[PDB]
Amino acid sequence: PNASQSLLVWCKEVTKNYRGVKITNFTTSWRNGLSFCAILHHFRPDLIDYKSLNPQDIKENNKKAYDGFASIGISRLLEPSDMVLLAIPDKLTVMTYLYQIRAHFSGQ
Amino acid sequence: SQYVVGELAALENEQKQIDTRAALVEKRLRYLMDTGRNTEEEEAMMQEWFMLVNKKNALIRRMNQLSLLEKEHDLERRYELLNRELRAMLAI
């Protein structure tokens, strides 16, 4: 498997069985914030209450995840307002961001 | 002082080469992603993009470790700097 495929497989393994998460790509699957928040919850459940998240709170879900990640050393590549007005998230930015999250937890 | 700046200078130079190659890999990889013109160069650029990300991450971690040490030195300079003020106060 190539670098994209292996990253996508990692995202699905880590978020497996989180309610409301459905990952099929590096764009619309990430918009609502849940997928990011599930990644955060899986590693650092002390930083976020996943069960109380509202699927329609696009800005707030994204903010919680970005702030959680920034608090452990992962640089912000996305702002919550990049999701506003139904924008499709930039593919290369989402991928790089996830790449950095996985690298952080792999000791890089 | 001596060890730190030598190492920071070298890392900061290497960081300049990384960011320079990466701007070009990005420009290109973005062009291919948007056009769909060559999914094979695309994948090869993605790989290179990520290698460059790995290098930069390893530099950043090395820099931060060194910066801690530099802060600990500086504090020590300040400790000795205070000892001088005490000395000079006694030179009557």
Author numbering:
A (entry chain B): 443 to 550
B (entry chain A): 1071 to 1162
Copy the relevant paper text.
EHBP1 was originally identified as an Eps15-homology domain-containing protein 1/2 (EHD1/2) interacting partner that plays a central role in GLUT4 transport and couples endocytic vesicles to the actin cytoskeleton. EHBP1 consists of an N-terminal C2 domain, a central CH, a C-terminal bMERB domain, and a CaaX box at the C-terminus that is a substrate for FTase4. In our previous work, we showed that EHBP1 is an effector molecule for Rab8 family members, including Rab10, and forms complexes with 1:1 stoichiometry. Our biochemical and structural data suggest that the interaction between the C-terminal bMERB domain and the central CH domain has a regulatory role in the function of EHBP1 and binding of Rab8 family members to the bMERB domain releases the CH domain, which can then interact with the actin cytoskeleton.
Since we had noted earlier that helices 1 and 2 of the bMERB domain are sufficient to form a complex with the CH domain, we then used the bMERBH1-2:CH complex and obtained crystals (SG: P 21) diffracting to 2.2 Å. The asymmetric unit contained two copies of the CH:bMERBH1-2 complex, sharing the same overall architecture. The interface of the bMERBH1-2:CH complex shows both hydrophobic and hydrophilic interactions with a buried surface area of 593 Å2. Most of the interactions with the CH domain lie on α-helix 2, with some additional interacting residues provided by α-helix 1. An array of hydrophobic residues including L1099, M1103 of α-helix 1 and M1116, W1119, F1120 and V1123 from α-helix 2 forms a contiguous hydrophobic patch on the bMERB surface with extensive contacts to L534, M537, and Y541 of the C-terminal helix of the CH domain. Besides these hydrophobic interactions, several polar interactions were observed at the CH:bMERB binding interface, including D532CH-R1100, T535CH-R1100, T538CH-W1119, Y541CH-N1124, and Q542CH-N1127. The Y541CH side chain also forms a hydrogen bond with the backbone carbonyl of F1120, and the R1131 side chain forms another hydrogen bond with the carbonyl of G549CH. Beginning with the C-terminal interacting residues of the CH domain, we could show that mutation of the conserved D532 to alanine leads to a more than 40-fold reduction in binding affinity, while mutation of L534 and T538 completely abolishes the interaction with the bMERB domain. The side chain of L534CH inserts itself into the pocket created by L1099, R1100, M1103, and M1116 of the bMERB domain. To optimize the contacts to the actin filament and to obtain the best fit to the CH-binding pocket, the CHEHBP1 model was manually adjusted to relieve minor clashes, mainly by shifting the short helix 522–529 (residues PSDMVLLA) and the following loop, and then energy minimized with Macromodel (Schrodinger suite) and PHENIX.
